[PDB]
Every structure is written in C-alpha cells, then in structure tokens.
Amino acid sequence: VNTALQEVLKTALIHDGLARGIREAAKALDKRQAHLCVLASNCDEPMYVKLVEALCAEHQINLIKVDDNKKLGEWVGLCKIDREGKPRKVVGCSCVVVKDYGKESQAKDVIEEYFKC
Amino acid sequence: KSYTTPKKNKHKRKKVKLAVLKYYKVDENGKISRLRRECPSDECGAGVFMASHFDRHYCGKCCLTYCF
Ligand SMILES: [Zn+2]
C-alpha cells in the first residue's frame, strides 16, 4: 500500500495538484478540498498535534499515520538537492495534503477499497 | 559606497513560529473557531484571512478597508 501511496504522491508532484504546506492545507480545508492527507504521529511537537488532529477530524478527511516529520521531506521533496544521491541540507514539514485530478490509476481500485472499507 | 546619512531599513518579513494557531483558536471540543475577520466580497476566497487591525479591517487584495 506504501508503494501505491508513493506513486500517488509522485503523480501529484507531476501534475502539481497537491497543496504542500500547512497554509495551503488550511486553504484547502477552508475551500473544502481535502481528499487524502498524511499525519506524522509520535513526534516531539508539544501542542501542534492537537491542532492537526482537530483540523483532520472536521469533514471527510482520511486518517493516515506515519512515524516522523523529517522522513516526509523526501517524498514531497522540500529540499531534494543532489537528486543522484542523498541531500546534505534539508528541513522538515508536518503535513502535505494532495488534491489529485488524474485519479485513475492501477492500484487506485485497491486504494479506494481500503479507504471505503 | 557609504554615505554620511545613515541607511534606513526595509520592511523585511521576519520569522514567526506557528502563526496559524494565532488565527484558529484551539477550543475544547472538535470545532473550529475563527476570531479574526474575513473578506465578505466574492473577489477573493474565504481562505484568505484579512488583517487584524485595532480599529478597522484591511482587505487582502482589493484594499476595501472596513471601518466601524
Ligand atoms: Zn482578501
């Protein structure tokens, strides 16, 4: 399922349909365009996780949990310098939401079967 | 290079940590609360939040300043 989510993130990066950043995510929820999102639990955030869960528990938003904030900077590509190898200067992010327009894919049937059930 | 009159500063955008909770007040139950005003016009969307001035409200793009 992680391969399918990474493929969805990569094609959202290709079509530029994702709204990266908490500012654009808040714009998407205020415009009611939140389809899928990724949340990094068990982090060192003192009180940010309550605000993120409060916005994520508003209206038809998926609940996906991952481990770290700094491991989400490579799939989105915040500071992916030296793409042939490992970056040496990189920062992190909390959540990046996606608004995919080209929804049709190969594993998307299994993805929507897991999301609906 | 350097003049006798000292140089004046420019409006540089400073670094503010976690400004979004300044707008969205985290209440007890799972309900969103907005304190700062928004632009009621249809020219700009509702996701853009206007300036919180002490005696008026400054529109984000159209400069339609609303006064009390
Ligand atoms: Zn505005």
GROMACS .gro file of C-alpha atoms in nm, chain B residues 3 11 20 49:
model
    4
  120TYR     CA    1   2.705   5.797   0.282
  128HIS     CA    2   1.019   4.603   0.554
  137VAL     CA    3  -0.183   2.963   1.230
  166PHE     CA    4  -0.780   3.590   0.622
   0.00000   0.00000   0.00000
